[model samples]
Target: MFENITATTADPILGLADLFRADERPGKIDLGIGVYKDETGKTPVLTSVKKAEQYLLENETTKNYLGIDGIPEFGRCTQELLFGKGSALINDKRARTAQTPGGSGALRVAADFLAKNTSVKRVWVSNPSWPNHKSVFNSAGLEVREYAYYDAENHTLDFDALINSLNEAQAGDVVLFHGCCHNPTGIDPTLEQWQTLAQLSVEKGWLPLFDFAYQGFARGLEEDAEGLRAFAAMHKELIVASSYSKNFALYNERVGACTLVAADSETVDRAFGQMKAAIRANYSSPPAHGASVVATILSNDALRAIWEQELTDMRQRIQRMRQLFVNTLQEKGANRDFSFIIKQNGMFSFSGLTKEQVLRLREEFGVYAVASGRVNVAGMTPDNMAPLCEAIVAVL
Candidate 1:
């Protein structure tokens, strides 16, 4: 069996990292992986997380398992953070939550649950979404379809095309949505467009599944959650897979949650039971340390405030980099009009570089960007921006 197994290619993002590490270039820049980097080109641990870890070290009494659903407080705190505290949906028993390994873990668990229980054979994702989104669902034996999202010609949201595609989605199909900060392409739907999506979800009876990996990266936590809130307000059956990897700077710790909203208490209870069973069958239970840290910070007013400020700092820094990139590109007189980069939210901007350009950026200038031209905007800093811009200009 082992002899017959074929070799597998490395993940694209991680592969880029490997190639960058091997290159001896003096000024290589990494903009491939989705991880957030500060102005110093480092992914810093949040102050709140450090404090939470200290508290856990002092008070953690057991090393025992947390059952299939992991820590209850983790689930509760994440629910409040994602759906808002005292949301009507939560109060009405229309929503339930479960802790998972990370955003990917949550998505896998949720996908398994949906594939098992529902008649959902097809899932619709944005035309350009996180690559793992398609991989996870396909591995679970679900057909993945793409709906119109990014307008390649102008680098914006194609609202008419998106709405028209969504209108054709059949009832019971899972319409997967990026709750905020769309990956690859940083474009997102407007509030009015979100309203239209909610209305369409209701009218078409498509089950909404939201992947919220960059909640605070796009805006404040509350504001970033607006899309999910709108969906919960409109649809009785909805699924949310959220993560703290980006927000809390805990990527390696793997902290995240999956939530399902049902029409009634009974359905909610049953759904959670099913989710727990799936979790039990899959990973048994999620890790404790990361979830505990997230819960401790979120549940405490002082720690939560500190976390908010840190998040704000990170968000503003990325926005500043976005502006700098656009200005530098325009000043360089590149053929591309990068003005859209400023309007795009979150840590990424689809730089619109071709595959050849991306390869050239890496080989010639040590600038590593995804082949699709997706750049992690947060990875840029004043120190590196000049070199990075120089590389881009040369490649163009």
Candidate 2:
């Protein structure tokens, strides 16, 4: 059986990292993988996280397993993070949360819960979404469909086409949305656009699934959550997969949660039973360290303040890099208008480079980017700024 199996293609984003690591060039720049990079080109541990972990190390006594839903405090903290401190969803007990391995794990658990329990049979994603969106939903035996999103030619959101495409979703169909900071494209719908989308979802009676991986990476925590909050306010039901990987810098620890908001406490309770069953059948229970750290930091006022400040620093750095990249490209005499880069939020953006151009960037200049022109904006730094722009201009 193993001998007959065909070799699978490497993951597009992760494969680029492998290539970057293998390259021997002294000044090779990497804009491929999506992760928060500091000014020194390192993904550092947040001082807040270090403090939280230190507290956990001193106090944590459990070697035993967590519940299928993970820590209760983690669940509460996650819901607050997603819906705000005093949200009626929590006050009315309409929202239930389950800790998962990561944002990916939350997504998978959500897919499984839908496939196994709900009447839903299809999940509609943006035309160009995180590459794994289709795979995650499809693996759970649900049909994956695409709605219009990015217009590659104009290098902006095709909102009209998007509304038109989503209009076709039948009632009860699940529509997956990037809560904020859309991956690969970094473009997000305006608050007005989000209101329109929420209204459409309500009118059409379709369920919204928010993949909120980069919560604090795009803007302020509350600001970045505005779009998802709009949905929560309008829709009777919503699903959220919240990740701390980017925000809390807990990539290796796999901290995340799946939050479900239903019509009432009774409905939410019933739905949570199914949610727990999905978790029990999948990985049994989530890991403890990451979620523990999150809970510790969030529950403590001082620690929370520090984490928020650190998150702000990361967000501002990405913004600064975006502006610098656009400026540098113009200075390097690129004929195209790359000003849109600054407008995009989060760690990634569609650089508007062709596949051939991306290949040339990698081979000739040792600057790596995804073949589809998606760049990790956080990867940019003052150090690599000049050469990266020079290479982009050369490719252009």
Candidate 3:
């Protein structure tokens, strides 16, 4: 059986990382891989997390395994952070929250539960969604499909196309959406657009499933979650998978969660039980360190205050870089509208570079980006502006 198994397939993003490591070139700018970096191009841990670890070192006693459901406090605080304090989902006993290894883990567990419970046949995702979206659902026996979102020709959202696709979805079909900070392409709908989607989903009777990988990485934590709050208010239920890797600087720690907002606690009872068993069947339980650290930061007032400030600073820096990048590109005289780059949110910008331009960028100029033209703005540093400008201009 082992001998008859299939061979390994190369992963595009990880492959880029390995190739980037191997490239021996001067002034190489890596905007590939969707990880956040500071002005110095380092993905450092948060100060609050470090303090939390220090507190845990002296306070925590036993190292015994956590429950299959993981930490209840972790679920509670994270859910409130994703939605808002005293959200209908929580206050009305409509939501079921559980800890997972990471956003991917949450997605997998939710997909399993969704596949096993609902009558839904297909789960729809954005055209340029995260590469793993299909894998997580397909492996769990859910058919995955895509709807138009981004306009490749002009680097803008195809809102009408998106609405039309959703309009075609059947009543019980599941629709995968990004709550904020859409991946691959950073462009997000306006506040009104979010409301329209919320209203439309309710009218169409479709299930809304959201992936929120970079919440605070967007405008702000509460502001970014506005879309989710709207959905929670309008709809009876929804699925949300969120990541702390980007915000909490806990990438290796694999901290994230799966939250489902049902009509009521009674409605979620069986599904919630099955979800617990699903998590148990997959990884048994989530790793304790990252969740405990985040839980400590959230529950302690002073720590939470500092952490929120830190998150704000990170978002501001990313916003600054977005405009700075577009300005630099314009200065280099590419002679096209780069304004869309500034309007796009989160760490990524679909810079409108074709795959051929991207390859030439890598081979000749040593500036690496994903073939899809998505660039991680967080990886851009002040020191890199000159060379990056030259490389992008050269490619253009």
Candidate 4:
């Protein structure tokens, strides 16, 4: 009956979680699956989001679908947050924003729009991008390629190779940047480096597709958007996908936006319609509840402040976890320096462990991580870190 789909394709991260759960070892720990967990190892809903949901419960009447472009307030508020207020592109009527189901949904919608409407077909992603990037874009009927991004040996950004690879990008092709907080490896380019790339974007004539999955995870929302601002200020047109699963803790809610900054008003008008059609052809409209939650917080002053402060706490906790992991590694007297873990940012770290070592950690110690050595620092807690440190260091 299912002859066409003979093989199963399980997500590596989710599969690792399954293995971790099945392990008989009492001290088994999961350092895979990208999600933020607090000290008690639970991803609690943010207070601001809770209140926003309450407000919607009381005030909202209908569960009817939003427009083809989704919530209007969500689109406007999201653009302001991503591009900053008084942004030239927005003020000049060069940018149009449309809400999508989630950041991944936004990515797919943008890919479809580019593939169908624009001359651009090939998209360049970081060599070690989020695993889904390739599959999603390829599914949208676009060519997906990679540019050198991370130096595994040194556990750092491969800036030289990255610049050289991007230089080969043809005009009208698309180049994907993580915006901030690179996946798999937490290494992000400096603000200065982002500026350099933004300048080169014009020279290379490659359309920029900035995937901002973890915005407030790296720095403050405004601060994290520095690269995006640079692009809006310099480039006439660009593609940006913003997500709320990380910031708003709305993983299941699935709220995000796909924004495009065009060369002029006419371009945005046309681009906006094409994007609407792309989304309509796919999902029709984004869900109502999640985006309404985001819109509520971003529009209200008190709720916005509360969300921002709590977001700060989340980012700080991730940093503390990074330090604790590195310090534990050093205290255990690992053969290598092991300091590279501290320099990495966001929820994950390269961990610098090889595929064989990762397998050994899982098989022998029940410490699970992606084969490429990406560890979710948020998954580790003070209680579990004590036990997992020995297992991780042992494999190294």
TM-score to native of every candidate shown = 0.97, 0.98, 0.96, 0.96
User: What tens-digit string does per-residue lDDT give for candidate 4 at 5-100?
Assistant: 778667777788678877998877888888888899788999999999999989999998789888888888988888888887768878788888
Task: Using TM-score, rank the candidates from best to worst.
Answer: 2, 1, 4, 3
Q: Please list the Cα RMSD from the true structure of every candidate, rounded to 1 decimal place.
A: 1.2, 1.1, 1.5, 1.5
Best by lDDT: 2
What tens digits encode model 1's per-residue C-alpha lDDT throughout 1-396? Answer: 588898989887778878878888778898888787887898888889999999999999998998788888787887888788998876787778888899999999999998887787989999998888899999877999999998998888999899888776899899999988998787777777788899888998999999999998777788888888888888888999999998999999999899988999899998889898888889998999999999899889999999999999989999999988888877766777778888888988898889999999988888999888889888999889888888899988
Cα deviation of 140, candidate 2, in Å: 0.6
Candidate 1 at 130: error in angstroms? 0.8
For candidate 2, what's the RMSD?
Answer: 1.1
List lDDT for all candidates, in order: 0.88, 0.91, 0.87, 0.88
Task: Flag regions of model 4 displaced more than 4 Å.
Answer: 22-25
lDDT of 3: 0.87
What is candidate 3's lDDT per residue for 1-396, written digit by digit as tens?
698898876676667888788888866778888777888878888899999999999999998989877888998998898879987677888888889999999999989988887787789999999888998899999998889998888778999999987776888889998988898888888889999999999998999998988988778889999988888889888989988998888889999999978888898766789898898888988999999998999999999999999899888888888888888888877788888888788988888788998899899988888888877788888888777778878888
Error of 2 at 25 (Å): 1.9
TM-score of candidate 4 on Cα atoms, chains taken together? 0.96
What C-alpha root-mean-square deviation, in Å, does candidate 1 show against the real structure?
1.2
| Model 4 residue 113 distance off true place after TM-score fit, in angstroms | 0.7
Error of 2 at 106 (Å): 0.6
lDDT, residue 34, candidate 2: 85
Model 3 lDDT, residue 362, Cα:
90
lDDT digits (tens) for residues 1-396 of candidate 2: 698998998998889878999999998998998888999999899999999989888998876999999999999988888989999898999999999999999999999999999899999999989898998999999999999999888879999999999878999999999988998788899999999999999999999999999888777888889999999999999999989998998899999999989999999999899999999989999999999999999999999999999999999998999899888898988988887788788998688889999999999999999998998889999999999999999988
In model 2, pairs of residues that clash are none
Off by over 4 Å in 1: 333-335
